[PDB]
Amino acid sequence: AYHIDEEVGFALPNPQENLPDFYNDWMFIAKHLPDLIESGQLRERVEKLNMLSIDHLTDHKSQRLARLVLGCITMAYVWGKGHGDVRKVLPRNIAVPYCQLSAALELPPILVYADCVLANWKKKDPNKPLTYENMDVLFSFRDGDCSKGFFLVSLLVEIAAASAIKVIPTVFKAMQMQERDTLLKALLEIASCLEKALQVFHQIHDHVNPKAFFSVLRIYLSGWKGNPQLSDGLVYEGFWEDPKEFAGGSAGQSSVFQCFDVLLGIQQTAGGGHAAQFLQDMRRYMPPAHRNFLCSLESNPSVREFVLSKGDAGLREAYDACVKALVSLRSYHLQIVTKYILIPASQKLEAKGTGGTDLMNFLKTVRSTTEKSLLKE
Ligand code: HEM
Ligand SMILES: NS(=O)(=O)NCCSc1nonc1/C(=N/O)Nc1ccc(F)c(Br)c1
Ligand SMILES: NS(=O)(=O)NCCSc1nonc1/C(=N/O)Nc1ccc(F)c(Br)c1
């Protein structure tokens, strides 16, 4: 369909954990990144790899795992230990398979949200539910980086959003079959589920330490677009001649928030402002099927103009309960950014620095664009 699952939403259902034996030399390096980065053998280990053909990867789930393996290796190679000794050329034995596979999955050749959260997980017990206690990630960068907590919590917020995503068919059908009562029950279920996704978001404090995120994990998630340590981008040796720039990972790459924006007719990606340009660009980092779902929603008739035209106050209050749950999420998110970036940065990403300023201004603009779509203030 649009690769949307009814249980896990945009998450890859039950990711694959093992690659064919043909790829053992890839898998060994990814499984041992904390150790290999710590000693400083990681970059040697990459430079001595053979060139493995991607032809022995024979389905989507196996391609997704291979992207996740190669994306983590690539971040470990470029940033190394995390202190400024960078590499600007990615050796051909990684770059050629990584670029070929990325072109086939229609994704930029850099680690994205959909690799390290949406496919980087397993159930411990396949019988018991999708809870933190029954889950684990497949790969980590450094001992102590809190990557399990950070990836698993993001995932659980995605799985929470799933119960709301499966109501979107009901909304477009109720509109055209002119079914007022079922449209209203649907809009309230969406809002109920966005409110539950916010409470799951609170669990990030239970599992992620600000100091570990800011001084360790954040560095391996960063990219090479507008990054002065790699001001021209990365050379993907043997595939493109010139360096190329790609952005680092963020849940701006999550289809979740963008999809309820389109649904509720809130015009973020609309305009030429720098906030609209960012959010549109982050769509190039989403899997193609999810990109297409988003664009499909953009073309269907407007839920906002429907509600606005029917003089029906219960409909307007149900629409508003959806707009409100997005403002809440985005406001809790500002708090999150303050606690995990602005405050640790003060111990150039500080609140009044050049980075911490443009990012808070972007986030506050998106939240305030959302808040304006309220029908009742
Ligand atoms: C330690 C935790 C987190 C931090 C520091 C953080 C930080 C940021 C920052 C700085 C941005 C600005 C855009 C960019 O530079 O890419 C951003 C964007 C965004 N983040 Fe986060 N984030 C965290 C976790 C999450 C989680 C768990 C979610 C949702 C599950 C999320 C959802 C979003 C969304 C949707 C955007 C795009 C802006 C918007 O649509 O309102 N973030 N995040
Ligand atoms: N680390 S700090 O910058 O110095 N703290 C400044 C205030 S935040 C804070 N204080 O206690 N817990 C905090 C927290 N908030 O989300 N998460 C957390 C912290 C430590 C851990 F080992 C784990 Br697991 C999770
Ligand atoms: N260089 S920077 O100033 O710190 N800007 C960094 C841009 S935001 C950021 N950084 O890490 N995570 C970020 C994020 N933001 O929503 N969500 C997130 C959550 C789970 C993931 F698997 C990934 Br991938 C991303």
Q: Please spell the DSSP secondary structure of 289-321, one letter per residue.
A: HHHHHHHHHHHSPPHHHHHHHTT-HHHHHHHHH
Ligand 3 atom 24 nearest Cα: 249
Q: What is the CA(219)–ligand 2 centre distance, in A?
A: 19
Task: Kindly state the DSSP code that residue 56 receives in the 8-state scheme.
Answer: G
Ligand 1 neighbours by CB, cut-off 6 Å: 154, 157, 208, 213, 250-252, 254, 257, 330, 333, 336-337, 340-341, 359, 362-363, 366
Q: State how far the Cα of 344 lies from the Cα of 216, in Å rounded to an integer.
A: 12
Ligand 1: distance of its center to the CA of 269 in Å? 16
Q: Is residue 211 in contact with ligand 2, taking CB distance under 6 Å?
A: yes
- Best CA proximity match to 15, nearest among 117, 147, 154, 161: 117
Residues 6+ away with beta carbon under 8 Å from 199: none
The number of the ligand 2 atom at minimal distance from the alpha carbon of 146 is 24
**Selection from 256, 274, 239 nearest residue 201 by Cα:** 256
CB atoms within 10 A of CB 73: 24
Output the residue whose Cα is nearest ligand 3's atom 25.
250
Cβ burial of 141 (10 Å; 0-12, 13-18, 19+) is: buried
CA distance 104 to 101: 5
Which atom of ligand 2 lies closest to the CA of 212?
Answer: 1
β strands within the chain, DSSP E: 89-90, 121-123, 135-137, 235-236
How many Cβ atoms from other residues are within 10 Å of residue 43's Cβ?
18
Let me know: does 93 contact 53? Beta carbons within 8 Å. no
Q: Is the CB of 304 under 6 A from ligand 2?
A: no
Tell me how far the alpha carbon of residue 17 lies from the centroid of ligand 3, in angstroms.
24
Distance 334 CA to ligand 1 centre (A): 9
- Counting from 1 in the atom list of ligand 1, the atom nearest the Cα of 197 is 30
Long-range contacts of 351-360 (CB under 8 A, 24+ apart): 360/334
Number of Cα atoms under 13 Å in the Cβ half of residue 126? 3
Total number of residues shown for the chain: 377
Mapped onto helix, strand or coil, the DSSP state of residue 241 is coil
| 3 annotated among ligand-binding-site residues | no
Q: Give the separation between CA 156 and CA 150, rounded to whole angstroms.
A: 10
Distance from residue 337's CA to the centre of ligand 3 (Å): 10
**What is the atom index within ligand 1 of the atom nearest the CA of 208?**
1
Which of ligand 3's atoms lies nearest the C-alpha of 117?
A: 22
Specify the amino acid at residue 317: E
CB of 92 closer than 6 angstroms to any ligand 2 atom:
no
- Centre of ligand 1 to C-alpha 241, Å, is 33
Resolution in A: 2.3
The Cα angle at residue 286 between residues 100 and 262, in degrees rounded to 5: 155
Measured in degrees and rounded to the nearest 5, phi and psi for residue 90 equal -95, 120
CB-side exposure of 103: number of CA atoms within 13 Å? 9
